[PDB]
């Protein structure tokens, strides 16, 4: 099978060619690698030889191809995917951007949830898969076993967003403001006897100075965050805060009977994982011996996390996450208002399940048909 893939040296491009290696993906497959820089050179060889590049941008070329797997971007899918469509390409477009995230020929990826939803459209057409938004997606495999049952009325959902989600720049940018801010009090702290409020006032002078690195975040990330991610929409929603409800039921195929979903999203100093903060409402009282099940049953992935203080503090943390694929959930309690009211904190590796690890799979799927 002919399969191509584009934006592959980007940074979920690179994500998603580690796992493809680790998972041999490469062994089912004819790759074809896709740029827009230097066409004709080499191709990357990470096991077997795949020839040139190709022409990223050449409708010609890509008509070949059976499959396309592009982590290229939104501004690339915009132009090309509709050029390859009407040009009469009837094969499989696997694309991360959020592009065709809400087109009506396109379904969400998220197969541990949905793998049903996506046989039927593959069955039946369906040429268009899109990965689903970071936060979604690592909401739903870790709530993957209450939602699929419908047993939630609505969710509550403060997020702490990590940088990765803003882009490769902005990683950086936030490890060069932590930088920035230890060179500020760097001595003061090395004599144990400093002044702490002395200490605090320079860093914050420091994060306050305009020579603090905030080209690509516009305010300070490291030692604050920042209440909005993305454009503000019609409402009160940011676009991010929003794709959470019009996305999760996509995905759990139910939007003419959705379930409502609203918060707050807020980005966090974290490098690559996004961590969640819900109030589930649920709608009848469940044992919480019960809820766990459910949940810790859904997918293999998802790992109950004892609600106790110190193993919580080992396990729940994006220190522990970043990384791997395992999709910790844990603070599993009733809330003070009401047994039909559960408490949960979730934590996710943003480049994997948030963004790559979907697409490798659905790819594997639609092969095994």
């Given at each position: 099978?002919?399969?191509?893939?584009?934006?592959?040296?980007?940074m979920v491009?690179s994500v998603?060619?580690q796992?493809?290696?680790?998972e041999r993906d490469?062994?089912?497959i004819?790759?074809v690698?896709?740029?827009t820089s230097?066409?004709?050179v080499?191709?990357?060889?990470?096991?077997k030889?795949?020839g040139?590049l190709?022409?990223?941008?050449?409708?010609?070329?890509?008509?070949?191809?059976?499959?396309?797997?592009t982590?290229q971007?939104?501004?690339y899918?915009?132009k090309?995917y509709?050029?390859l469509?009407?040009?009469?390409?009837?094969?499989?477009?696997?694309?991360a951007?959020?592009?065709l995230?809400?087109?009506?020929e396109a379904?969400?990826?998220?197969?541990?949830?949905?793998?049903?939803?996506?046989?039927?459209?593959?069955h039946?057409?369906?040429?268009?898969?899109?990965?689903?938004?970071?936060?979604?997606?690592?909401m739903?495999?870790?709530?993957?076993?209450?939602?699929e049952?419908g047993?939630?009325?609505?969710?509550?959902?403060?997020?702490?967003?990590?940088?990765?989600?803003?882009?490769?720049?902005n990683?950086?940018?936030?490890?060069?403001?932590?930088?920035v801010?230890?060179?500020?009090?760097?001595?003061?702290?090395?004599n144990?006897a400093?002044?702490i409020?002395?200490?605090?006032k320079?860093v914050?002078?420091?994060?306050?100075?305009?020579?603090?690195?905030?080209?690509?975040?516009?305010?300070?990330?490291?030692?604050?965050?920042?209440?909005?991610?993305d454009?503000?929409?019609?409402?009160?929603?940011?676009?991010?805060?929003?794709?959470?409800?019009?996305?999760?039921?996509?995905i759990?195929?139910?939007?003419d009977s959705?379930?409502?979903?609203?918060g707050?999203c807020?980005?966090?100093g974290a490098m690559?994982?996004?961590?969640?903060?819900?109030?589930?409402?649920?709608?009848?009282?469940?044992?919480?011996?019960?809820?766990?099940?459910?949940?810790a049953t859904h997918?293999?992935?998802?790992?109950?996390?004892?609600?106790?203080?110190?193993?919580?503090?080992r396990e729940?943390?994006?220190?522990?996450?970043?990384?791997?694929?395992?999709?910790?959930?844990?603070?599993l309690?009733?809330?003070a208002?009401?047994?039909?009211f559960?408490?949960?904190?979730?934590?996710?590796?943003?480049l994997?399940?948030?963004?790559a690890e979907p697409?490798?799979?659905?790819?594997?799927?639609?092969?095994?048909?």
């Open positions: 099978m002919r399969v191509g893939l584009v934006g592959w040296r980007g491009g998603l060619m796992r493809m290696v680790e490469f062994d089912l004819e790759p690698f896709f740029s230097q066409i004709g080499p191709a990357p060889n990470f096991g030889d795949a040139m190709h022409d990223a941008f050449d409708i010609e070329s890509l008509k070949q191809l059976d499959a396309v797997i982590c971007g939104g501004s899918t915009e090309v509709p050029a469509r009407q040009a009469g390409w009837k094969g499989y477009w696997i694309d951007a959020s592009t995230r809400m087109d009506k379904i969400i990826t998220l197969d541990p949830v949905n793998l049903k939803q996506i046989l039927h459209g593959i039946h057409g369906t040429k268009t898969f899109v990965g689903g938004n970071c936060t979604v997606s690592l739903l495999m870790a709530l993957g076993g209450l939602y049952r047993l939630v009325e609505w969710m509550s959902a403060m997020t702490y967003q990590a940088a990765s989600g803003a882009g490769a720049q990683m950086r940018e936030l490890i060069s403001q932590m930088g801010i230890n060179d500020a009090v760097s001595s003061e702290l090395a144990p400093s002044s409020l002395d200490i605090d320079k914050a002078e420091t994060m306050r100075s305009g020579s603090f690195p905030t080209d690509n975040f516009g305010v300070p990330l490291a030692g604050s965050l920042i209440p909005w991610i454009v503000k929409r019609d409402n009160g929603q940011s676009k991010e805060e929003w794709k959470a409800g019009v996305e999760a039921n996509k759990l195929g139910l939007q959705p379930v409502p979903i609203d707050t807020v980005r966090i690559r994982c996004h961590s969640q903060a819900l109030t589930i409402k649920l709608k009848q009282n469940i044992p919480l011996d019960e809820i766990e099940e459910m949940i997918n293999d992935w998802v790992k109950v996390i004892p609600n106790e203080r110190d193993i919580t503090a729940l943390t994006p220190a522990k996450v970043t990384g791997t694929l395992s999709v910790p959930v844990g603070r309690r009733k809330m208002m009401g047994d039909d559960l408490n949960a904190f979730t934590v996710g590796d943003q994997l399940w948030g963004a697409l490798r799979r659905t790819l594997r799927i639609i092969l095994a048909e």
